[PDB]
């Protein structure tokens, strides 16, 4: 297959994405959830890991790490410490709202994914770290967990397999930096949400010092469907090493901003013109697209024509798939103001533990405010580029890279706009 897209409704992972059906246990069990889970738990953790890694499923958090190897990292005999599975339900990245829909309208899929993953790596329990803002979603998730507990699906002797598995929900307290796995682990332990240094990896020392595997909501909820339908069916979609389906949140300057499930290698133009109803003012009015949320750089209208929405094609285009969050800006947008607002967001959401991000992101915030106002000189522009090269790769966590990348993308694709703004300010003020 060379052309991708137009996914049929029978192949969608997340049926009832929009909440049109019952989200409770009766409604979820009638859609195929919680079906033959005992066979999955009894066929073996190695069988589950093999079925996961055969499908070519990658991490849906944004890193794109292969989840089969990551889940098999902690598939080791115990040394007296318990093992833990942790679900990352923070979703603080701008443009990304898919996990909210997953935990609001399909919570039993998340619970079954927690059980299947915990059996896959021998985890004692599941700690779902939900966002603090998502109070109603957390209440719905706890209601579904209570329904699963009452029906005997989770808890002592889960689904009649002899495996004991608990599911816990921990509410956050409004921190974007707590979305990253090590900072999330420290946040569960009742400390400041400051990321750890790897090594040690969470598979060796994680939450409470126990071995821990942190996985996204989307990459957990697909695993029961992986075990039931099979890995080859999931591998049939998408290109090589880009297999499966993806939840895309299209927002910004579009006709119909929406969350939709589609294939992995869909062209961006086809996806926007089909599911979002096209951008405002037609495709000739498009200025820029951020394809993977605020952590990824933008691409201009020329790049957007023949780009595929998977990991490899966007890495080739000097960007990343990220969380598959398409923010669209038309030609009536002050894009420098948008990038300055993104850098201000990164300055306000920064844990401040390590020096390069803590000073540099504030430095880019000040110089991008000056760039928006035009009170700068062109020789600063390359200097700002160098500042980005002093943040990317020299930080504890990846918030520094995710703050340096939008500045680099904005500079690379719109240096003439910034130079025109600076020369206009110099003409009008001197």
């Amino acid at each position: 297959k060379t052309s991708f897209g137009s996914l049929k409704d029978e192949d969608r992972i997340f049926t009832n994405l929009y909440g049109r059906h019952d989200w409770r246990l009766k409604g979820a069990q009638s859609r195929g959830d919680w079906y033959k889970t005992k066979e999955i738990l009894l066929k073996g953790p190695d069988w589950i890991l093999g079925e996961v890694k055969t499908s070519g499923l990658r991490g849906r958090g944004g890193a794109g790490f292969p989840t089969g190897l990551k889940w098999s990292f902690m598939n080791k005999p115990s040394d007296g410490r318990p093992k833990y599975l942790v679900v990352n339900a923070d979703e603080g990245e701008p443009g990304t709202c898919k996990d909210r829909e997953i935990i609001r309208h399909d919570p039993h899929k998340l619970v079954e994914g927690c059980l299947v993953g915990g059996r896959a790596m021998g985890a004692r329990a599941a700690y779902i770290y939900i966002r603090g803002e998502f109070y109603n979603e957390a209440s719905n998730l706890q209601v579904a967990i209570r329904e699963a507990y009452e029906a005997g699906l989770i808890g002592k002797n889960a689904c009649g397999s002899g495996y004991d598995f608990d599911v816990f929900v921990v509410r956050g307290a409004g921190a974007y930096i707590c979305g990253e796995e090590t900072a999330l682990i420290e946040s569960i332990e009742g400390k400041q949400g400051k990321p750890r240094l790897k090594p040690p990896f969470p598979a060796d020392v994680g939450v409470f010092g126990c071995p821990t595997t942190v996985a996204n909501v989307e990459t957990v909820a697909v695993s029961p469907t992986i075990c039931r339908r099979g890995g080859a069916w999931f591998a049939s979609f998408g290109r090589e090493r880009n297999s499966g389906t993806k939840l895309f949140n299209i927002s910004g300057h579009v006709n119909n901003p929406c969350t939709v499930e589609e294939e992995m290698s869909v062209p961006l133009k086809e996806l926007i013109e089909k599911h979002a109803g096209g951008v405002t003012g037609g495709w000739d009015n498009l200025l820029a697209v951020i394809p993977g949320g605020s952590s990824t750089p933008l691409i201009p209208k020329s790049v957007c024509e023949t780009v595929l929405m998977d990991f490899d094609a966007l890495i080739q285009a000097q960007t990343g798939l990220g969380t598959a969050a398409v923010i669209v800006m038309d030609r009536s947008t002050d894009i420098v103001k948008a990038i300055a607002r993104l850098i201000e967001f990164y300055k306000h959401e920064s844990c401040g533990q390590c020096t390069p991000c803590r000073e540099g992101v504030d430095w880019m915030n000040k110089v991008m405010a000056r760039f928006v106002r035009g009170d700068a000189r062109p020789a600063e522009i390359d200097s700002l580029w160098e500042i980005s090269k002093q943040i990317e790769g020299h930080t504890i966590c990846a918030l520094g890279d995710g703050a340096a990348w939008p500045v680099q993308g904005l500079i690379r694709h719109f240096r003439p706009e910034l130079e025109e703004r600076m020369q206009r300010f110099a003409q009008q003020h001197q």
């Binding site: 921190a175 400041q192 240094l197 090594p199 300055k347 306000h348 959401e349 920064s350 844990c351 401040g352 533990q353 390590c354 020096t355 390069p356 803590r358 000073e359 540099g360 992101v361 504030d362 430095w363 000040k366 110089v367 000056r370 600063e380 200097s383 090269k389 002093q390 790769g393 020299h394 930080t395 504890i396």
Partner: protein, 230 residues
């Protein structure tokens, strides 16, 4: 023996398993620049000055917290190591106040010495610097939090050696401040040792304030007689 062979600038050296890169470089005789590392405190790894380049590895690693692997070639004088050191010095000196003539750490400041050795020689910071409100922790330690570099040796010493657990970092981002968050004094029997471990002039000795300068003092090695410890 279970020693493993690592390389510092092409020179082989045997180390115990679990040894860090910084300890191996100290074994071969090279002192990697550091701010938050202390051999009697727990490893924090946040100042990012100890970043060094391993050969055939496209990412600098923090030598104060990175255990050595077999066959690793550590390059302590490579080009990108010096680039990382210069960038970290620029970030550290971006918000530091111009207080060197009126600061008691002048002449024995670690930040000054490593800025002279491994840092650059000019500033590109055209913006305004931050200012931090001063704190009071007693009549022993004079506190100027504007000069702090958030190295978190304060909390590590007060939690692991003094056993007080009264200092901490309040806030987030560039507004993160080291303090007690309330009007409390840090009175332990080993409090003044924090003046020894602060690499900057944020915590100074209040009786010693504005009296002398390190280059003009003569050092005489003697023995304390205040107790029977010696």
């Amino acid at each position: 023996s279970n020693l493993i062979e690592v390389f510092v600038d092409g020179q082989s050296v045997m180390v115990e398993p679990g040894t860090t890169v910084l300890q191996a470089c100290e074994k071969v005789g090279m002192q990697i620049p550091r701010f938050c590392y202390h051999e009697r405190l727990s490893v924090a790894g946040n100042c990012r000055m100890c970043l060094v380049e391993i050969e055939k590895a496209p990412k600098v690693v923090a030598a104060c917290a990175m255990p050595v692997m077999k066959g690793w070639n550590i390059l302590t004088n490579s080009e990108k190591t010096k680039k990382a050191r210069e960038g970290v010095m620029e970030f550290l000196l971006a918000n530091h106040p111009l207080d060197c003539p009126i600061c008691d750490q002048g002449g024995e400041c670690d930040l000054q010495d490593q800025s002279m050795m491994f840092g650059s020689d000019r500033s590109r910071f055209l913006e305004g610097k931050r200012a931090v409100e001063d704190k009071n922790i007693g009549p022993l330690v004079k506190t100027i939090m504007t000069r702090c570099i958030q190295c978190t040796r304060c909390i590590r010493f007060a939690s692991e050696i003094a056993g007080v657990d009264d200092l901490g970092t309040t806030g987030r981002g560039n507004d993160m401040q080291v303090g007690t968050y309330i009007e409390k004094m840090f009175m332990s029997e080993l409090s003044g040792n924090i003046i020894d471990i602060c690499p900057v002039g944020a915590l100074t000795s209040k009786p010693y304030a504005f009296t002398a300068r390190p280059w003009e003092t003569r050092k005489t090695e003697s023995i304390d007689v205040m107790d029977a410890v010696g």
